[model samples]
Target: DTRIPAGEATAAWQWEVSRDTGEVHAMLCACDAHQAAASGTSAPARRMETTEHRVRSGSVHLLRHDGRPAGMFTLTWDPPFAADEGAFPPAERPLYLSRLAVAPEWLTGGSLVGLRCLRRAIETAAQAGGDALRSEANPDLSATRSLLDILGFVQHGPTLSDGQGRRRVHLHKSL
Candidate 1:
């Protein structure tokens, strides 16, 4: 992991893996804010329900900086890999990162904080016996793509369309 200067107490941060539904709800709300901003529309009310469902079964990680929430990351354990799977081939263990976002106002310093959060998540997964990490990132977001590339993630397959019609490029990295 890159050794970026850790922020001082005034900007010090804490990371936690949330197991509570309430915390997951908060993370979901924050994610909706980002999506709303990106799409230039008020995020649909149904988003709350969908997010809640995913949070209930997924793992949510939160980052708090300077005593305030700064960002969050979410991952879902994909079923045991199949040998012939197209997106993800059979592996001893693989974790699917589904959502990761930093508050827009906190997107400063070339997104250093966000990258730190990502590195933390990856390390945590590795320690938990994860052998691979995968994510579907939107190609339109150049910054996200660049960050993944810098972290050694490689493109694995064609783009996929989300329910809302957004196209995302698949990427994976062996742990």
Candidate 2:
């Protein structure tokens, strides 16, 4: 099993294994509980609905472990700058990765399960005609920043703030 410790949160987050297929599941309750317990954070009940809407609207792949929903990550062929234009434009490469979230308990991973999940997503995007992968890392999260850096994602320019009110560092990598 993979586990990533959210230091100071003591949330005890780790991926739950499926007894039947040994795959990851993305249950919203599990994710919510983990987040709430770890950081005193709780998502609105409608958050999952919104997430599902975005995932479907963007045509992103969703994955589960052992017949259970585990998490969500989206790949876009349209770059952020172009995506804001309303329609996905033709591109030799994908512009960015939109969302990546693991249920709190499942975020813990020492065996690179998280990395593998990300790598698989990138590979899938590449196979689907994507040329590059891009993402914006939350600037305040040093662990996230380091993880992206270790994965060879490069900072593109100055940090920017998202609509969510979080400051972010833009990054990109060739697929």
Candidate 3:
């Protein structure tokens, strides 16, 4: 299911993000783990709250695989930027892909799970009346860059620092 469930399922998902435990947490934390291992450093300390923030923003999409929740990505029509930030440029009715994370298990052995999640994001944005689907890629993450490039998302601006020591490049695909 692309949409997260209600009642008990919601509670369970929140619990996972909140406590930084369970499948949801593991899926989200995997990115941090990968980054940390690649950089030979520690994972970020505030990921649990950031995951909760993404959820509370009402833009999260859950991906279920084989009768279980396996991945999640967040999308937003309204870009979360202040006037001075100038992060995502102006676009007509654009949907923004904010975050994506998949379970390590689902990504093993040449799995195409990440591709499926992004394909769904594009489809979802088009169906939701977006004229374009926008996103930012941290240049440090090669996987994100490759996926967006293969999906026809073109870069629109010079890289910018995300205030968290990460460089991000903005991109969009017209729908």
Go through the candidates in order and give each one's C-alpha lDDT. 0.68, 0.54, 0.67
Q: Cα RMSD (Å) between model 1 and the true structure?
A: 4.6
Q: Encode model 2's per-residue lDDT on 2-98: one tens digit a residue.
A: 9876674343322321232112124444544554455443432434554455455654454455544556555665543432322222336565675
Q: Output the number of the lDDT-best candidate.
A: 1
- 41, model 3: CA deviation in Å? 7.0
Model 2 residue runs over 4 Å out of place are 1-50, 80-91, 109-111, 162-165
Please report, as a residue range, the 10-residue window in candidate 2 with the lowest summed lDDT: 16-25
How many clashes show up per model?
A: 0, 21, 0
TM-score of each: 0.73, 0.60, 0.71
Candidate 2, residue 164: lDDT: 62
* lDDT (10s digit) by residue, model 3, range 75-167: 787764432324444676888886677676776556577886787788889998988887766666776677789899888667787577766
Distance (Å) between predicted and true CA of 56, model 2?
2.7
Better of 2 and 3 by lDDT: 3
Predicted model with the maximum TM-score: 1
- For model 1, residues 1-175, the per-residue Cα lDDT tens digits are 8875664763577887665666556655676567667655454343446456665665777788775667777766763222224765446788877667776667656648778778977887788889888776667666667888899887766667557856667677889
What is candidate 3's local distance difference test score? 0.67
Model 1: residues with Cα > 4 Å off, grouped in runs? 1-11, 19-46, 53-58, 79-84, 162-164
